[PDB]
């Protein structure tokens, strides 16, 4: 139909977010396929979005699955989403340094905790051994969330907006 040919409404782009990464998540995870997606909000992320890959491109499961197949340009590093696009791929995170992470745990909790220890974002992880999926926020990691903790989680975190009339122009960035 025609909405949708002269802009884009807030609160679709953030429930389409969360469907992506819960999609997305949970193709990878079933697979055991390793993943990082780091969603920015109030403090910004875009000097680690400048040491990965640039994409700037529409968010969607199937290409939040295709960037983590392994052995691939992109898989090897962060998914950056800000606003509404996949900023970057293979993006570079701060590690977290914290003995308090659990020494089974690889590279990307450690990254994700360490992203969570100095912004405000909201990062997810796919375990490659487990299938596991965690996620950090404010220095703290949740480990392997059942599919309706994830989605209680993400919608509290990155849904700002109520049910109200549509618009493209709410709550403009
Ligand atoms: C200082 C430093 O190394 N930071 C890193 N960030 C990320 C997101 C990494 C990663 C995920 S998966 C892989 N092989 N490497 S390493
Ligand atoms: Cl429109
Ligand atoms: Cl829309
Ligand atoms: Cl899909
Ligand atoms: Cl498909
Ligand atoms: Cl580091
Ligand atoms: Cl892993
Ligand atoms: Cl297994
Ligand atoms: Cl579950
Ligand atoms: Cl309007």
């Not at 700037?56 to 898989?75: D, R």
Request: glycine fraction near 8%.
């Amino acid at each position: 139909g025609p909405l949708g040919s002269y802009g884009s409404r807030i609160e679709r782009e953030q429930h389409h977010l969360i469907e992506s990464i819960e999609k997305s998540t949970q193709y990878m995870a079933k697979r055991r396929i390793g993943a990082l997606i780091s969603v920015a909000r109030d403090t910004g992320m875009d000097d680690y979005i400048e040491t990965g890959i640039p994409l700037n491109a529409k968010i969607s499961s199937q290409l939040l699955i295709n960037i983590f197949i392994p052995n691939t340009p992109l898989h090897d590093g962060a998914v950056i989403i800000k606003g509404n696009e996949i900023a970057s791929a293979a993006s570079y995170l701060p590690l977290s340094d914290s003995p308090f992470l659990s020494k089974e745990l690889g590279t990307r909790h450690r990254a994700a905790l360490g992203i969570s220890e100095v912004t405000d974002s909201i990062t997810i992880v796919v375990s490659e051994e487990t299938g596991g999926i965690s996620l950090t926020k404010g220095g703290e990691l949740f480990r392997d969330v059942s599919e309706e903790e994830l989605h209680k989680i993400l919608l509290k975190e990155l849904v700002t907006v109520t049910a109200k009339k549509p618009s493209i122009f709410s709550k403009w960035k």
